[PDB]
Design a protein around this ligand. Structure first.
Ligand SMILES: Nc1ccc(-c2ccc(S(N)(=O)=O)cc2)cc1
Ligand SMILES: [Zn+2]
Length: 257
């Protein structure tokens, strides 16, 4: 029953998920002046050429574009990571207004939305196992600002009318997630958590410095989705973001000077 409403939103989650008040919760504010360049950080290796998208699902909290992760087909390596992380899904968090929607903030700036490409550490065998480990997941976070359209996002936007409500899914094959990346792979990185229940502290966060731009029409279509199931009172899927959590005993590292 957790959600993003007045009565079940982020400030309530701790009652069912006590880890909500844990030592490495996400998202966080990225204070760019305090983040330290780490010369020992490697370039990110994003290898998405062999990606196999399968399906798009409205899960009542966001929509997931899901990939075949039964083989090393689309993987993230390098950067802060040891080993190989397989792409399982991507999704977004977004606002009711262009001035909010991102989970991470940059010097307190909120972006219109945030893309999360979720990967799991292959040494743990599958995703369910991986989320139980402190280095189980790597989530690549990419900010969205409103300006010019992102041509690579349009295929996602156009299928949304077919998954308007919670529990709806649609075939979604041959989608290339490379079309969602910015030019630069400069990043910040820190140890954190899932940003929704179960809020497990299993994520190495890698957040790209360069946002992608999407059009107002593209984000407007995100905002036409529903949190509710079909035949239930319409509640627009908007503001499905958790606010910044205390940094506590963590340092944010930068890949760039
Ligand atoms: N069972 C289960 C396992 C993991 C998640 C989950 C996965 C990724 C994220 S996020 N928003 O990418 O940090 C948040 C939650 C949700 C449900
Ligand atoms: Zn997310």
């Amino acid at each position: 029953h957790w959600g993003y409403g007045k009565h079940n939103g982020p400030e309530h989650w701790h009652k069912d998920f006590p880890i909500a008040k844990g030592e490495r919760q996400s998202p966080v504010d990225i204070d760019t002046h305090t983040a330290k360049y780490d010369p020992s950080l490697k370039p990110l290796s994003v290898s998405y050429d062999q990606a196999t998208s399968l399906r798009i699902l409205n899960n009542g909290h966001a929509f997931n574009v899901e990939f075949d992760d039964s083989q090393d087909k689309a993987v993230l390596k390098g950067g802060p990571l040891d080993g190989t992380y397989r792409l399982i899904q991507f999704h977004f968090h977004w606002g009711s207004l262009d001035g909010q929607g991102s989970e991470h903030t940059v010097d307190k700036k909120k972006y219109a939305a945030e893309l999360h490409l979720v990967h799991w550490n292959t040494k743990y065998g599958d995703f369910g196992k991986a989320v139980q480990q402190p280095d189980g997941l790597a989530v690549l976070g990419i900010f969205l600002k409103v300006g010019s359209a992102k041509p690579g996002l349009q295929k996602v936007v156009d299928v949304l009318d077919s998954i308007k409500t919670k529990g709806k899914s649609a075939d979604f094959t041959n989608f290339d997630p490379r079309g969602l990346l910015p030019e630069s792979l400069d990043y910040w990185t820190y140890p954190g958590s899932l940003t929704t229940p179960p809020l497990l502290e299993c994520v190495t966060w890698i957040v790209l410095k360069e946002p992608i731009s999407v059009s107002s029409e593209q984000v407007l279509k995100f905002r036409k989705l529903n949190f509710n199931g079909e035949g239930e009172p319409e509640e627009l899927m908007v503001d499905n973001w958790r606010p910044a959590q205390p940094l506590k005993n963590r340092q944010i590292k930068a890949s760039f000077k």
